[PDB]
Ligand binder design. Structure first.
Ligand SMILES: NC(=O)C1=CN([C@@H]2O[C@H](COP(=O)(O)OP(=O)(O)OC[C@H]3O[C@@H](n4cnc5c(N)ncnc54)[C@H](OP(=O)(O)O)[C@@H]3O)[C@@H](O)[C@H]2O)C=CC1
Ligand SMILES: NC(=O)C1=CN([C@@H]2O[C@H](COP(=O)(O)OP(=O)(O)OC[C@H]3O[C@@H](n4cnc5c(N)ncnc54)[C@H](OP(=O)(O)O)[C@@H]3O)[C@@H](O)[C@H]2O)C=CC1
Lengths: 329, 323
């Protein structure tokens, strides 16, 4: 048997039970991965809470780095260059909080030999997200200025470094002075406190951009920042609302987008930017290229035993984590 | 003195009032225009109804073609025939407009066609070239295909090598929409999912690259459901009424799509920008890439009846008021 974190009923971090499960078997198109490091993602909390509904019970999580223990039967091995023994990482696994899990080969990348498994499980899901946000949702160009909320979070630090490397000025928000320094170290040109009032905060942003506003806002915080994000945009700018850490954004009168400057609102999901193995491989390769040139550096921001998934979810929801955190099996 | 159409209280078409006013003088950078044809635009109804607030009382309308009667101090001269979509108080025998947002009318474009084409044609330009830059091979959905904006969007998109699907309310309108270049003309959505199902059948399962939706309340859900992944919903109007607040997670579920609510104001920000869009519009008219028909005429005094017809979905294409 193996250890796993199973959810039998949805609810708070408390429902994350460390239990014995049979080792899974890979199906068609799947690899069986023996975990070395397991990624923690804010979306895990939405599945745990039952926000994002899923069939019960389930072993939680989708991000894992480890070694290929087995390749699914049938045609599978003919359709991938991944082989048993390879160190691999996926953001699309089933039941990642376990010693062993499965993932589609087409949405799994080989880890470069100079990248540790902890860094890979810190980098992939959030790094693919930063990639699509910066290259596809709003393609940043040198000279732009963007706003990135939660600048010292997992996605936040990657967005900040990568945008800075691309010649983009980045303004961030964080909750503590410790996080402010990490954000500056990541390349943020200015770090602000969280908005108290949308117009007040937008004025700060306008001050910094000469009244223009930012070309794009990357908002992964949602409820507490949305109004401020919308108010901070340059004419025809893009609000990429990609997360809801503080809670869901209430229904938006489309005429607000007019008043704000004929802006665009989009709410993307990673699913729509990893639609083929070809697309996934392209983004994963650009991510590992950026890491290996030190265009970005993905630090391991926190580590927990797999059995302490509960503790990680508590710290994450309490705004106590910095950067990417991993579970260790 | 001059005749004008004024609103002293907001409401339905009934609040439109005949008034005589002194002829205006143009301020700095402005032209005084003697109207030959006055444009009618759905936005006129939003100002009349109070849906778009404005300090009362005021004279309705912003689109006019006529001759320059006077210039404010500060290549347009008195005597020149011009058209603007940014005039103040256009439902009148004379009005003012900023010279920087006024175009000279090509000599072979009638004044009615100018007042049928400019506001709506600048809108079609920004929608097709700026909000979502259509590409040859794209398919787009345009609601109200036989309306003023809809006919221009359809012809221009078709010229650009884009496939257009439209909606209209009548068989007469369906014929006009096909003649404008629409590849398929559909009935308005009854069920959003079934409508989207039909659109996906027409696009090889893909959905459309963009929806240009100027109808709003009665089409929005279907527009959203018809999009290709990462497509753009350009909600630029609200003829059927305002779109209810949109849960951003619906944009996720629809395929990580973009939603945008553009205003002509943000696409005519400089004289340079205006001139670029206007020139491309008149180039298209001059080469017959598009042809703007006058779809109806009303006396200035009958602005009430024009607004009644507009809201009752009875107009076909661009309509004008004549002094
Ligand atoms: N759409 C997509 O494809 C994807 C979306 N996401 C989303 O992006 C966001 C970032 O993900 P991830 O890097 O894993 O998480 P983070 O590491 O960014 O952690 C969330 C951070 O948000 C900030 N925050 C502000 N208000 C709150 C609150 N009320 N509760 C908790 N946190 C708050 C906190 O930092 P601070 O101290 O600055 O407040 C916190 O550290 C998440 O919302 C996630 O759901 C992630 C991956 C893919
Ligand atoms: N910059 C911008 O954002 C601009 C936006 N617009 C908007 O674009 C839209 C089209 O403008 P315009 O060409 O002047 O108007 P149209 O000539 O298109 O008239 C509106 C049409 O919409 C259709 N419609 C569908 N449902 C309704 C309803 N319940 N009530 C009334 N009409 C309905 C009707 O035709 P059918 O028989 O097909 O139903 C009607 O003819 C308007 O909503 C306008 O506000 C216009 C200019 C600039």
């Amino acid at each position: 048997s193996m250890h796993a974190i199973e959810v039998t009923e949805t609810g708070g971090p408390g429902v994350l039970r460390h239990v014995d499960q049979p080792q899974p078997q890979p199906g068609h198109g799947e690899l069986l991965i023996k975990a070395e490091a397991i990624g923690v993602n804010f979306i895990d909390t939405y599945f745990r809470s039952g926000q994002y509904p899923r069939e019960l019970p389930f072993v939680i999580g989708s991000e894992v780095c480890g070694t290929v223990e087995a390749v699914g039967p049938g045609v599978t091995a003919a359709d991938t260059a991944i082989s048993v023994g390879d160190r691999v990482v996926s953001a699309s696994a089933n039941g990642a909080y376990a010693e062993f899990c499965t993932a589609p080969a087409s949405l799994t990348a080989k880890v470069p030999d100079d990248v540790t498994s902890e860094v890979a499980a810190s980098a992939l899901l959030k790094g693919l997200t930063a990639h699509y946000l910066l290259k596809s949702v709003y393609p940043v160009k040198r000279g732009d200025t963007v706003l990135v909320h939660a600048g010292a979070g997992g996605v936040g630090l990657i967005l900040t470094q990568w945008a800075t490397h691309l010649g983009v000025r980045v303004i961030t928000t964080v909750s503590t002075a410790e996080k402010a320094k990490l954000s500056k170290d990541a390349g943020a040109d200015v770090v602000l406190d969280y908005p108290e009032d949308a117009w007040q905060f937008a004025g700060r942003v306008r001050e910094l951009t000469g009244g223009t506003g930012v070309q794009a806002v990357y908002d992964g915080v949602g409820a507490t920042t949305f109004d401020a994000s919308l108010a901070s945009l340059a004419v025809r700018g893009t609000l990429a609302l990609f997360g809801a850490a503080s809670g869901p954004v209430p229904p938006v009168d489309p005429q607000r987008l007019n008043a704000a400057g004929s802006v665009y609102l989009t709410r993307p999901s990673l699913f729509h930017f990893t639609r083929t193995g070809e697309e996934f491989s392209w983004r994963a390769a650009e991510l590992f290229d950026a890491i290996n040139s030190e265009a970005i550096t993905v630090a391991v921001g926190g580590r927990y035993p797999l059995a302490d998934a509960l503790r990680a979810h508590q710290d994450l929801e309490a705004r106590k984590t910095v950067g990417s955190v991993v579970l260790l099996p």
